[PDB]
Amino acid sequence: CTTSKECWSVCQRLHNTSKGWCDHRGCICES
Numbered sequence: 001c002t003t004s005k006e007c008w009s010v011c012q013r014l015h016n017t018s019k020g021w022c023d024h025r026g027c028i029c030e031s
Contacts, residue, residue, distance in 0.1 A: 001027055 001007055007020025011029030020028045 001022035004021040007022050007027035007029065008018070010020060010027045011017045015029070017029050017031045019030045022028070
């Protein structure tokens, strides 16, 4: 990631979800 904003196009481009934020384990994916 860069910040929280690179987890907004991660599971939206893989699955069918929306937003996210970045922790030090990876990207969080919220619907």
